[PDB]
Homo-oligomer: A and B are copies of this chain.
Amino acid sequence: SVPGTTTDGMDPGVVATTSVVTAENSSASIATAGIGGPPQQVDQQETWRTNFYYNDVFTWSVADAPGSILYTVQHSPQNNPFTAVLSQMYAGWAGGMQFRFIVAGSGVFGGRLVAAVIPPGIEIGPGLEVRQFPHVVIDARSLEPVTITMPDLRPNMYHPTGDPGLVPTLVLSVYNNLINPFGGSTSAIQVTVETRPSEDFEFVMIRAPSSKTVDSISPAGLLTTPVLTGVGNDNRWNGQIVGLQPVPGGFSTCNRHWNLNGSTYGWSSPRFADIDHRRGSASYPGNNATNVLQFWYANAGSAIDNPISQVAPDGFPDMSFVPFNGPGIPAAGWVGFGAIWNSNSGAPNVTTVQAYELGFATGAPGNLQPTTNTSGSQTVAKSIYAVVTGTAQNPAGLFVMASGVISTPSANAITYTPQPDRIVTTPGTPAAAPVGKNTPIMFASVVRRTGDVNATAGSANGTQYGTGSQPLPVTIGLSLNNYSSALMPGQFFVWQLTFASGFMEIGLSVDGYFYAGTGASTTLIDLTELIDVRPVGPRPSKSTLVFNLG
């Protein structure tokens, strides 16, 4: 007679049924999955089938109204750690799964929860009324675990591994409010979810592992622990990612950006190399040719060097041109080392070596102003320091290096240079908008400045930051594979990031933007004491990502 305070790893507890669990469902499922041949990996005494293994944990507080959604999960073999490994050698799967819930409360609390299975074809989100489905009610004072089973309600005969199809969804909601009769600061409890395959889960058709690999099915391995710790760079400045920058207003980034369709709207490959263009007018203001600023420009839509697009040459920064003249260093400009070369043979001009500032302008021989849309604009170079002589050749070419630094007037630092007001964008790209409490984020990096090249992180003169939209391994991996059959429009792919003290969640949309649920805060996330990164899977987009650092 064991007590209920100790639970065994094979123990389901109380089995809570629902009207969707029927015998004819199981018989039809087995008899129609039989077209894939005999079932595989169905030995009932194996250790990977008999035990429950960890899936998730969530929080239930007293401020949650009835009908609030606390936890959702889509039907997949990626919810178990061992059926995700075994799916690399098979081409189909069919069957159900069991989910075990443990509520960590006491006998003094009040309140109840509700769980139901949602058939495919129904949108999951706020306004989904769970209590008018066939449901099970679970008390907050329960000591033994409660397990319900999600069956396979599908319109196919089996699920192909790349393209499963329509699946059911398990949703847990709030029946009645949580009550603490004492009242005070202690108002929250925690529930843990675990998973185990059911008795009719199987695979069917064996295949070579050197077929469609694990990097073409789900983008779970695109974001790992060393990517955000010490290996990955950003897609704008090619610098070490140190933090996360919330943007509560919104932004749109076009160049060197990839969606979940294997497509780009920009004009750059996913690599950092030289910027080369020819056939552009070069000039210099004034008459004296010693210590004279150098000017160069060319129109947009003419650079025939890229197989991708001809808006700008490969590697051009997507920043609007800040206008300047005279002996004044501009504020927050993309500057980089380079020189102007001779278009007839390729011989560079040796005396015209300086740091040139790049951007997008509207009138280059006339008055100078920044511009954002690429239609009717042009690409403009102008050196920030004094250079010797100037070539007035009409087809003259420009050669700049890959990486750049910030142009600052003084030795002190400023805010993140790439603010969302001035980002040059091709017309036709979508923007990133806040969805509820979730707001778009960028990836911060320590980038040197032209007023103090010795300055690093933690310096006494301030730290200079430059931001990008995606990490570089992510956009490299997004241009090699296709993930159309991994995320519906209106969903996020969620990763859990743990720290030494707290943990937070980030999500990736179909458009290729990253999100975090922080509201209207503008504080940088430190991202120094990060420990582990774990994938979670598809979740509804109108659900708050958990953000607590403590």
- Residues of A whose CB lies within 8 Å of any CB of B are 19-20, 22, 24-25, 27-29, 31-32, 34-38, 91-92, 119-122, 152-155
5 A–B pairs (Cβ distance < 8 Å), ordered by A: A22-B38, A24-B37, A28-B34, A35-B155, A92-B121
**Complex CA–CA separation, A20 to B36 (angstroms):** 8
A122: B residues at CB distance < 8 A: 91
A31: B residues at CB distance < 8 A: 28
A92: B residues at CB distance < 8 A: 119, 121
A35 contact from B25, B35, B37, B91, Cβ within 8 A: B25
Listed residue (A25, A35, A154) with the most chain B CB atoms within 10 angstroms of its CB: A35
A38: B residues at CB distance < 8 A: 22, 24
A119: B residues at CB distance < 8 A: 36, 91-92
Count copies of this chain in the complex: 2
Residue of B nearest to A90 (CB): B119
Asked if A35 and B32 make an inter-chain contact with CB atoms under 8 angstroms apart, the answer reads yes
A129 to chain B, nearest CB (A): 12
Asked if B34 and A24 make an inter-chain contact with CB atoms under 8 angstroms apart, the answer reads yes
Interface of A is mostly: loop
A154: B residues at CB distance < 8 A: 35
A37: B residues at CB distance < 8 A: 19-20, 22, 24-25
A151 to chain B, nearest CB (A): 9
A32: B residues at CB distance < 8 A: 28, 32, 35
**Complex CA–CA separation, A28 to B35 (angstroms):** 6
A127 to chain B, nearest CB (A): 16
Asked if B35 and A121 make an inter-chain contact with CB atoms under 8 angstroms apart, the answer reads no
**Complex CA–CA separation, A97 to B35 (angstroms):** 16
Residue of B nearest to A156 (CB): B35
Asked if A27 and B34 make an inter-chain contact with CB atoms under 8 angstroms apart, the answer reads yes
A35: B residues at CB distance < 8 A: 25, 28-29, 32, 152-155
A19: B residues at CB distance < 8 A: 37
**Complex CA–CA separation, A29 to B37 (angstroms):** 11
A121: B residues at CB distance < 8 A: 91-92
Listed residue (A19, A119, A152, A154) with the most chain B CB atoms within 10 angstroms of its CB: A119
Listed residue (A25, A122, A152) with the most chain B CB atoms within 10 angstroms of its CB: A25
3 closest cross-chain pairs (CB), A and B: A24-B34, A91-B119, A28-B34
A91: B residues at CB distance < 8 A: 119-122
Residue of B nearest to A39 (CB): B24
A20: B residues at CB distance < 8 A: 37
Residue of B nearest to A89 (CB): B132
A28: B residues at CB distance < 8 A: 31-32, 34-35
Residue of B nearest to A19 (CB): B37
Residue of B nearest to A155 (CB): B35
**Complex CA–CA separation, A28 to B38 (angstroms):** 12
A153: B residues at CB distance < 8 A: 35-36
Given A22-B38, A27-B34, A35-B153, 4 more A-B residue pairs with CB atoms under 8 Å apart are A28-B31, A29-B35, A36-B119, A92-B119
Listed residue (A24, A120, A154, A155) with the most chain B CB atoms within 10 angstroms of its CB: A24
A34: B residues at CB distance < 8 A: 24-25, 27-28
A116 to chain B, nearest CB (A): 12
A24: B residues at CB distance < 8 A: 34, 37-38
Listed residue (A20, A92, A120, A154) with the most chain B CB atoms within 10 angstroms of its CB: A92
**Complex CA–CA separation, A25 to B35 (angstroms):** 5
**Complex CA–CA separation, A37 to B20 (angstroms):** 7
Residue of B nearest to A168 (CB): B91
Listed residue (A22, A29, A32, A36) with the most chain B CB atoms within 10 angstroms of its CB: A36
